[PDB]
Amino acid sequence: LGFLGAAGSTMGAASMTLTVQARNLLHWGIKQLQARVLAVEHYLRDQQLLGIWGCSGKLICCTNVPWNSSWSNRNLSEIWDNMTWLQWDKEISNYTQIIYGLLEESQNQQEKNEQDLLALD
Amino acid sequence: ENLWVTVYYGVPVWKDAETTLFCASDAKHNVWATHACVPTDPNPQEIHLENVTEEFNMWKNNMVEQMHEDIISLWDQSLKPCVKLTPLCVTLQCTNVTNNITDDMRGELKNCSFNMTTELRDKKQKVYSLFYRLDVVQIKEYRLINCNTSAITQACPKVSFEPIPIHYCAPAGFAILKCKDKKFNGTGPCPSVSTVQCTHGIKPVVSTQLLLNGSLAEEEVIIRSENITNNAKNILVQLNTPVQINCTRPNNNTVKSIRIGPGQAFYYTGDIIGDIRQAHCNVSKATWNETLGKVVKQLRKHFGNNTIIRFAQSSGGDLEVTTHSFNCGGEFFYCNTSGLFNSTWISDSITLPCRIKQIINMWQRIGQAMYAPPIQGVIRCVSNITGLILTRDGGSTNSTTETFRPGGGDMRDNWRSELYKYKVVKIEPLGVAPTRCKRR
Amino acid sequence: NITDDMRGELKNCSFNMTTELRDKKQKVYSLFYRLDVVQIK
Ligand SMILES: *[C@@H]1O[C@H](CO)[C@@H](O[C@@H]2O[C@H](CO)[C@@H](O)[C@H](O)[C@H]2NC(C)=O)[C@H](O)[C@H]1NC(C)=O
Ligand SMILES: *[C@@H]1O[C@H](CO)[C@@H](O[C@@H]2O[C@H](CO)[C@@H](O)[C@H](O)[C@H]2NC(C)=O)[C@H](O)[C@H]1NC(C)=O
Ligand SMILES: *[C@@H]1O[C@H](CO)[C@@H](O[C@@H]2O[C@H](CO)[C@@H](O)[C@H](O)[C@H]2NC(C)=O)[C@H](O)[C@H]1NC(C)=O
Ligand SMILES: *[C@@H]1O[C@H](CO)[C@@H](O[C@@H]2O[C@H](CO)[C@@H](O)[C@H](O)[C@H]2NC(C)=O)[C@H](O)[C@H]1NC(C)=O
Ligand SMILES: *[C@@H]1O[C@H](CO)[C@@H](O[C@@H]2O[C@H](CO)[C@@H](O)[C@H](O)[C@H]2NC(C)=O)[C@H](O)[C@H]1NC(C)=O
Ligand SMILES: *[C@@H]1O[C@H](CO)[C@@H](O[C@@H]2O[C@H](CO)[C@@H](O)[C@H](O)[C@H]2NC(C)=O)[C@H](O)[C@H]1NC(C)=O
Ligand SMILES: *[C@@H]1O[C@H](CO)[C@@H](O[C@@H]2O[C@H](CO)[C@@H](O)[C@H](O)[C@H]2NC(C)=O)[C@H](O)[C@H]1NC(C)=O
Ligand SMILES: *[C@@H]1O[C@H](CO)[C@@H](O)[C@H](O)[C@H]1NC(C)=O
Ligand SMILES: *[C@@H]1O[C@H](CO)[C@@H](O)[C@H](O)[C@H]1NC(C)=O
Ligand SMILES: *[C@@H]1O[C@H](CO)[C@@H](O)[C@H](O)[C@H]1NC(C)=O
Ligand SMILES: *[C@@H]1O[C@H](CO)[C@@H](O)[C@H](O)[C@H]1NC(C)=O
Ligand SMILES: *[C@@H]1O[C@H](CO)[C@@H](O)[C@H](O)[C@H]1NC(C)=O
Ligand SMILES: *[C@@H]1O[C@H](CO)[C@@H](O)[C@H](O)[C@H]1NC(C)=O
Ligand SMILES: *[C@@H]1O[C@H](CO)[C@@H](O)[C@H](O)[C@H]1NC(C)=O
Ligand SMILES: *[C@@H]1O[C@H](CO)[C@@H](O)[C@H](O)[C@H]1NC(C)=O
Ligand SMILES: *[C@@H]1O[C@H](CO)[C@@H](O)[C@H](O)[C@H]1NC(C)=O
Ligand SMILES: *[C@@H]1O[C@H](CO)[C@@H](O)[C@H](O)[C@H]1NC(C)=O
Ligand SMILES: *[C@@H]1O[C@H](CO)[C@@H](O)[C@H](O)[C@H]1NC(C)=O
Ligand SMILES: *[C@@H]1O[C@H](CO)[C@@H](O)[C@H](O)[C@H]1NC(C)=O
Ligand SMILES: *[C@@H]1O[C@H](CO)[C@@H](O)[C@H](O)[C@H]1NC(C)=O
Ligand SMILES: *[C@@H]1O[C@H](CO)[C@@H](O)[C@H](O)[C@H]1NC(C)=O
Ligand SMILES: *[C@@H]1O[C@H](CO)[C@@H](O)[C@H](O)[C@H]1NC(C)=O
Ligand SMILES: *[C@@H]1O[C@H](CO)[C@@H](O)[C@H](O)[C@H]1NC(C)=O
Secondary structure (H helix, E strand, C coil), X not given: CCCCHHHHCCHHHHHHHXXXXXHCCCCHHHHHHHHHHHHHHHHHHHHHXXXXXXXXXXXXXXXXXXXXXXXXXXXXXXXXXXXXXXXXXXXXXXXXXXXXXXXXXXXXXXXXXXXXXXXXX | CCCEEEEEECCCCEEECCCCCEEEECCCCECCHHHCCEECCCCCCEEEECCCCCEEEHHHCCHHHHHHHHHHHHHHHCCCCCCECHHHCCCCCEEECCCCECCCCCCCEEEEEEEEECCCCCCEEEEEEEEEHHHEXXXXXXXXXXXXXXXXXXXXXXXXXXXXXEEEECCCCEEEEEECCCCCCCEEECCCEEEECECCCECCCCCCCEEECCCCCCCCCEEEECCCCCCCCCEEXXXXXXXXXXXXXXXXXXXXXXXXXXXXXXXXXXXECCCECCCEXXXXXXXXXXXXXXXXXXXXXXXXXXXXXXXXXCCCCCHHHHCEEEEECCEEEXXXXXXXXXXXXXXXXXXXXXXXXXXXCCCCCCCCCEECXXXXXXXXXXXXXXXXXXXXXXXXXXXXXXXXXXXXXXXXHHHHHHHCCEEEEEECCEEEECCCCCCC | CCCCCCCCCXXXXXXXXXXXXXXXXXXXXXXXXXXXXXXXX
């Protein structure tokens, strides 16, 4: 139940601890400051990705991008109940930049226009 | 079916990473980290990670390099306010000491005198003091060692050299993983892994050919090296039992001091009270005999059956690697380890002679040197061996025998014995998943 | 063997230089350019 205690759990079970994990993400004087400044910058960059996706208000969100299952031939029960997040991250390591690009371009660009059109009238 | 991309934040996934670690200590002046660091967490936390097989590799561990640079910079800061001895490079005429002496190699201790400056630019004084042979080179006329190679700085006498434990703690967004598996050889997957906010305290103990005052193996002697088949590589051996070291300097030396210039003072060895005797360190014969037998058994597992294993003294190199260095009371000792390695294996105490040197260069840097102030009175020092550094004379395929000799000369190898347990990782909270869902 | 330059441009000079030990001095000589040296010979 502690930090990274979920590492051995299944991906579904691990979802219970997401909030706990979030709380822990946030001459020698120069070295110490560089570590702290970078920790802040890295945190903010991840928040920006969520802000573009519109997911920044939640730990969990859905998107309008289809899964394209040919990326990995597995069932949902095979993924969620029989595998860890550590293993999963390796399975899709070659598709991560693709998925992020799809979310920023294929979803946000359509949503902002439809919302503006409703606002205009 | 109709699967969709979803996004999760706070996901418990980590990647290998390197970052600055924050020094802390549980700890009046000392050369060590207590002046450069902050208090530790009084109750460190640990979380076991179930079903985790995370790989460790001590030979690639960047924490070793980070500690090295912090230790060197830390040590140098202690000499910045201290006295310069540049005025002392002089003709330095000397003669042999005559006294009630059991001595050592003849000429080991000398009675020297020189023309030295005073508080005033207009005046000089005649002084005399004792020096060890190791610090004096013949030009009779003499020069101090390194008078033609480097400036010499006197360490401040008020500053302690006694080791103080150092802890390292992760910055936010990072975590330190620890291998708990017993009999780990420092590489490959670790069967039991846990996460800690900070490391256990590590003392900066400096020694050669033997590892002192470190951690012990939990059950049995562990032998590890970067490449067990490569004779060039140092072999670290961690003992599962302690072996003590008892060192002493019986001579009752005295200390005198003279002011030099307006801002500086010099400390030197005065007359020695009572009989003059050789400095020495004891090693238990019975304890060492058992210790070697355990090491040999483990070596056979790595080097095969029915190989005759022998030990020997180093064939060459500088005093720094051919002898065992100590720092006791701030005095620097070099001891001849022969008789500890004088054995062949097929199937009450030892006294080692020691020598004292006042001019040292702990980090083997060219152009640097330090003069220790002499310590008044009799010194006794008790410490223990927690491991050995060995190298092979082998690599030959033409023999049924093998021989080992002591290694050393690289301080980083000592720290590996405490840091092999730890790895640093970065936490990456963002990830995605296929689960079917809908949104507006 | 001199084809020279502006006359006096190169100079042959000598002095008492200090040594490794505080107790001793050494005699040396060296060449200087006229621009490097000013008369106070
Ligand atoms: C102090 O006494 C020792 C012993 O007499 C001197 O060492 C000897 O030096 C001579 C002359 O070169 C040698 O022939 C001997 O073999 C040395 N004896 C040894 C090594 O036992 C030493 O030189 C003296 N020190 C001074 C500064 O005079
Ligand atoms: C500083 O002085 C020492 C002593 O004179 C020098 O070491 C000698 O180097 C020569 C080279 O001919 C040898 O023949 C000697 O055996 C050396 N003497 C000793 C006592 O080892 C040293 O070279 C000088 N400076 C440096 C940088 O080495
Ligand atoms: C620590 O032990 C492991 C085995 O538990 C060693 O792993 C070896 O890796 C090499 C890679 O080529 C294999 O060929 C070996 O078969 C593995 N083990 C054995 C017994 O052969 C690992 O190298 C060891 N680490 C050290 C520093 O010796
Ligand atoms: C070693 O030398 C010290 C002095 O450097 C001796 O200490 C002296 O002990 C006598 C005992 O009567 C005192 O009167 C002196 O005042 C002490 N001197 C000091 C404190 O500087 C010590 O006893 C000697 N040890 C021996 C002879 O075993
Ligand atoms: C290390 O062992 C040696 C040998 O037992 C000790 O030497 C003896 O020391 C006592 C004084 O403590 C003397 O009275 C004996 O005469 C010594 N025996 C000799 C010289 O053969 C030595 O003291 C031990 N060192 C320590 C620190 O205990
Ligand atoms: C430690 O002492 C031993 C002697 O006890 C030194 O070795 C001797 O070296 C000579 C010359 O090669 C040999 O003839 C001797 O047989 C060696 N030991 C003997 C004879 O017992 C050794 O060099 C010393 N170590 C250091 C670092 O000085
Ligand atoms: C290894 O650790 C021991 C125990 O701390 C050290 O022995 C202590 O040394 C200090 C400093 O001289 C003394 O104040 C203590 O009283 C000693 N403890 C004893 C004698 O039980 C030993 O010096 C250490 N070794 C090294 C090389 O630092
Ligand atoms: C799965 O996605 C890849 C791109 O990552 C695409 O080239 C492939 O055609 C996709 N399969 C489909 C859409 O059936
Ligand atoms: C996934 O499992 C379900 C039952 O939970 C099954 O009906 C379905 O065919 C599976 N999908 C596959 C194998 O692609
Ligand atoms: C879970 O995955 C393992 C391999 O990691 C596989 O051997 C096993 O059959 C899976 N269990 C299921 C699908 O119930
Ligand atoms: C992803 O790339 C790695 C090499 O970086 C490769 O070994 C792996 O098979 C790739 N995964 C897929 C699904 O192609
Ligand atoms: C492995 O994960 C399971 C998840 O239920 C857990 O019960 C188990 O304790 C973990 N490891 C071990 C050794 O049990
Ligand atoms: C050596 O011992 C004798 C006899 O105790 C003593 O008289 C003498 O002072 C001691 N040493 C010297 C240099 O006199
Ligand atoms: C100090 O200088 C004087 C005068 O030159 C000289 O007589 C004396 O021997 C010198 N002392 C030493 C120790 O060199
Ligand atoms: C050890 O060195 C030998 C030299 O032949 C090499 O063949 C071997 O791969 C090395 N083992 C390692 C790097 O684990
Ligand atoms: C130190 O002396 C003790 C007894 O007081 C002995 O047990 C131990 O072996 C000695 N340590 C050495 C010789 O390194
Ligand atoms: C050194 O020689 C001088 C000569 O006067 C003597 O007075 C002094 O006691 C000697 N020092 C030692 C330690 O013998
Ligand atoms: C060590 O002790 C054993 C008996 O336990 C003895 O046979 C051996 O000779 C001793 N030392 C050496 C170097 O053999
Ligand atoms: C030698 O081989 C035997 C088995 O034949 C084994 O029991 C023994 O432990 C081996 N000796 C070693 C590895 O030193
Ligand atoms: C070292 O071993 C050799 C060979 O057995 C022996 O001759 C020599 O006396 C030994 N040295 C000591 C100090 O025991
Ligand atoms: C070895 O020396 C250290 C010095 O701190 C001490 O703490 C430890 O208990 C000693 N081990 C023994 C005596 O077995
Ligand atoms: C300089 O000139 C003279 C003749 O005037 C000649 O003998 C001498 O060798 C020359 N020196 C050289 C060329 O180095
Ligand atoms: C060194 O100084 C002395 C002082 O008498 C002087 O006579 C000599 O010429 C000088 N040597 C030089 C300048 O090379």
